[PDB]
């Protein structure tokens, strides 16, 4: 019997074409009811957006018989591979493909009934409408700003831009550049500086829905930027990062934060790391250099993915069937099918195993929905350092368990309302007066400042016969300043 | 017709603090405005009608 | 030698086929100059955003050995046969369809 | 419409040309294709036109 299998990865099939046999040797090793049996494999390295690329390398393998399909792919560029495995009844085991640790995008496909999945999205789900409808009640919102880069496909939670209609707050949306010095290039030159710091003190409600890399350039650098002085949150949640770029970032800041990645319990013994007689290679059961913080989420879907055939192909070892796909022109509508792919429909999709990323259970369109978190976090202060305490444990069952200046001032003449009262060499110095004394008041119990501008004018500016405003009025009006906070005559 | 059709008008209703609201428009308006009044409340609902 | 197109449209192929079938026909009644040969078409009809029948149903076209390509179908319909027309070099005129 | 427009103007300006190449047939599920080696030319003859 020809025991072969296909696997196509595309760019950047790189960790495919390095972690991949780190458990197809411990199959062909450690394993006892495959003992007997002969184990084979598969590994592409082919170019990425490329469906009819991979076709060749498809309808190439199908001649050779394949029992099961592992691909890392996108929405686009696989609805082929789904409408592929439906008259054969061939598995086919998905990821789907980001650039950086960016968030994702579930895709959309045929007018076909539900209960056919024969592609699975091994990916966790995004069930981040929710937590967002956590932290737009429980972190006390109203105006804040919202982000995402370039090279994501942005409509992850265009369903959660609906219900802040209907709550009543203010999101502010930006793309990110691919240079982020092209960002502090538009935000420094292209802009205005009143509309600047407006938007700054807007920002200092923000959220970056990014990367784990380019976001670490970008934040400790907005940091560097003065945008943070004492305290605000800004968030993300996400799957993965490393220790050390935690601490980079939120030890390089001793402001409110988010941070949140994905955690399971794992085994540090030898026959612990056993599923179906089968070794989980992790950390734990496999230590390498650089490999300490290796935290791609592809890891415990890859080694769970061969543990879930392991599983499955026992069983149908148990079936007692085989079939083997014959060479073939892909050209065929009414094609050869595989007879034990109903079973290996079922010995999978009901097939499960308990293992150390907790319960891999199935549904019936491309889901594994269970999934849960925890939630280690810190306000700012100096006493203890910025280190952890548990705040919050997310789960897919129970929820979210825990939970959570100088201004733009021109003034009018005539010192017997506000006087220059200091004028030193160089500087006429202090402007003392009434409304000082306001500014005082103003100033004396937050910490935030002033820039007091001169209009020799003097004019309490008047709506002239030029449909304008002398002097200072207009000059508000055309923001170059903003406040002339003062004696000012009232006129309606 | 998605979000990504229009992704930089969020982003220049932002620069001149234009205050961005959207909702997602289902299949019939009639099963539209049943659901607003059996789930929301009436300060929700005409406060934010005006 | 003859001319010899595709044409592949997705759901609902019958208003294209209302366009395309009597378009084609009306042009040798009428031409001087595509009187020394005629445009044959073959209709492949495929599935609702599927591009697999588009393979399918145009790997006999390239049985038929066609020279160009007629396709109404959606944005999931085209990265295979864009993956594909870079190979054939055909010009692959491609529009998208209206999603209702 | 508009595509079979163009296209038929790309058949008449290729006759115009007075050259013809044609298609060959070919199961292109095999790597040995035959890649359609006038690809350009009468590409400058189609992308010009209106």
């Given at each position: 019997?020809?025991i072969?299998?296909?696997?196509?990865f595309e760019?950047n099939?790189?960790?495919?074409?390095?972690?991949f046999?780190?458990?197809v040797?411990d199959?062909?090793?450690n394993?006892?009811?495959?003992?007997s049996?002969?184990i084979?494999?598969s590994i592409?390295?082919?170019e990425a957006?490329?469906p009819f690329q991979?076709?060749?390398?498809?309808?190439?393998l199908m001649?050779?018989?394949?029992?099961a399909?592992v691909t890392?792919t996108g929405?686009a560029?696989?609805?082929?591979?789904q409408?592929l495995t439906?008259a054969?009844?061939?598995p086919?085991?998905f990821?789907?493909?980001?650039?950086?640790?960016?968030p994702?995008?579930?895709?959309?496909?045929?007018?076909s009934?539900?209960?056919?999945?024969?592609?699975?999205?091994s990916?966790?789900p995004?069930?981040?409408?929710?937590?967002m409808?956590?932290?737009v009640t429980?972190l006390?919102?109203?105006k804040?700003?919202?982000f995402?880069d370039?090279?994501?496909?942005?409509?992850?939670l265009?369903?959660?831009?609906d219900?802040a209609?209907?709550?009543?707050?203010?999101?502010?949306?930006?793309?990110?550049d691919?240079?982020?010095?092209?960002?502090?290039?538009?935000?420094?030159?292209?802009?205005k500086?009143?509309?600047?710091?407006r938007?700054?003190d807007?920002?200092?409600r923000?959220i970056?829905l990014?990367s784990?890399?380019?976001?670490?350039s970008f934040?400790?650098?907005?940091?560097?930027?003065?945008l943070a002085?004492?305290?605000?949150?800004w968030?993300?949640?996400?799957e993965?990062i490393?220790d050390?770029?935690i601490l980079?970032?939120v030890?390089?800041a001793?402001?409110r934060?988010?941070?949140?990645?994905?955690?399971?319990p794992?085994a540090?013994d030898?026959?612990?790391?056993m599923?179906?007689?089968?070794?989980?290679?992790?950390?734990?059961?496999d230590?390498?250099?650089?490999?300490?913080?290796m935290?791609q989420?592809?890891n415990?879907?890859?080694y769970?993915?061969?543990?879930?055939?392991?599983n499955?192909?026992h069983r149908?070892?148990e079936?007692?069937?085989?079939?083997?796909?014959?060479?073939?022109?892909?050209?065929?509508?009414s094609?050869k099918?595989?007879?034990g792919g109903?079973?290996?429909?079922?010995?999978?999709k009901?097939?499960?195993?308990?293992?150390?990323?907790?319960?891999m259970?199935?549904?019936e369109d491309s889901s594994?929905?269970?999934?849960q978190?925890e939630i280690?976090?810190?306000?700012?202060?100096e006493?203890f350092?910025?280190?952890?305490?548990?705040?919050a444990?997310w789960?897919?069952?129970?929820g979210l368990?825990?939970?959570?200046?100088?201004?733009?001032?021109?003034?009018v003449?005539?010192?017997?309302?506000?006087?220059?009262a200091?004028?030193?060499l160089g500087?006429?110095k202090?402007?003392k007066?009434?409304?000082?004394?306001?500014?005082?008041?103003?100033?004396?119990?937050?910490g935030?400042?002033?820039?007091i501008?001169q209009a020799p004018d003097?004019?309490?500016?008047?709506?002239?016969?030029?449909?304008?405003?002398?002097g200072?009025?207009?000059?508000?009006?055309?923001?170059?300043?903003?406040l002339?906070?003062s004696?000012?005559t009232?006129?309606p």
């Amino acid at each position: 019997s020809i025991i072969h299998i296909g696997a196509i990865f595309e760019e950047n099939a790189a960790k495919d074409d390095r972690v991949f046999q780190l458990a197809v040797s411990d199959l062909s090793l450690n394993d006892d009811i495959l003992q007997s049996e002969k184990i084979t494999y598969s590994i592409k390295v082919i170019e990425a957006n490329n469906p009819f690329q991979a076709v060749q390398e498809a309808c190439d393998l199908m001649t050779q018989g394949i029992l099961a399909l592992v691909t890392s792919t996108g929405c686009a560029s696989a609805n082929a591979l789904q409408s592929l495995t439906d008259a054969m009844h061939i598995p086919h085991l998905f990821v789907q493909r980001n650039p950086g640790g960016s968030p994702r995008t579930a895709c959309h496909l045929n007018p076909s009934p539900d209960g056919e999945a024969y592609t699975l999205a091994s990916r966790p789900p995004v069930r981040l409408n929710d937590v967002m409808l956590r932290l737009v009640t429980e972190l006390r919102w109203q105006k804040f700003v919202m982000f995402y880069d370039s090279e994501y496909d942005i409509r992850g939670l265009q369903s959660f831009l609906d219900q802040a209609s209907r709550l009543g707050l203010d999101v502010s949306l930006q793309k990110v550049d691919k240079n982020i010095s092209h960002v502090f290039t538009s935000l420094f030159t292209t802009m205005k500086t009143e509309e600047l710091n407006r938007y700054r003190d807007t920002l200092r409600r923000a959220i970056l829905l990014l990367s784990p890399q380019g976001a670490h350039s970008f934040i400790n650098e907005a940091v560097e930027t003065n945008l943070a002085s004492k305290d605000s949150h800004w968030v993300f949640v996400n799957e993965e990062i490393s220790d050390p770029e935690i601490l980079d970032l939120v030890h390089s800041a001793l402001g409110r934060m988010t941070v949140v990645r994905q955690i399971f319990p794992s085994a540090k013994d030898n026959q612990k790391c056993m599923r179906n007689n089968h070794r989980i290679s992790s950390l734990l059961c496999d230590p390498q250099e650089g490999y300490l913080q290796m935290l791609q989420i592809s890891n415990l879907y890859l080694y769970d993915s061969v543990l879930m055939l392991a599983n499955a192909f026992h069983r149908k070892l148990e079936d007692r069937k085989w079939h083997s796909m014959a060479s073939l022109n892909c050209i065929r509508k009414s094609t050869k099918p595989w007879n034990g792919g109903r079973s290996m429909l079922d010995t999978i999709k009901k097939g499960h195993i308990t293992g150390l990323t907790g319960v891999m259970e199935f549904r019936e369109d491309s889901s594994n929905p269970y999934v849960q978190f925890e939630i280690l976090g810190t306000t700012y202060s100096e006493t203890f350092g910025k280190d952890m305490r548990k705040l919050a444990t997310w789960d897919s069952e129970k929820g979210l368990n825990g939970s959570l200046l100088t201004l733009k001032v021109v003034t009018v003449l005539e010192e017997p309302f506000v006087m220059v009262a200091e004028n030193i060499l160089g500087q006429p110095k202090r402007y003392k007066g009434f409304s000082i004394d306001v500014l005082d008041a103003l100033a004396k119990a937050l910490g935030f400042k002033y820039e007091i501008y001169q209009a020799p004018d003097g004019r309490y500016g008047h709506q002239l016969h030029n449909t304008s405003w002398n002097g200072m009025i207009g000059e508000l009006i055309s923001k170059r300043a903003d406040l002339a906070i003062s004696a000012i005559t009232i006129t309606p």
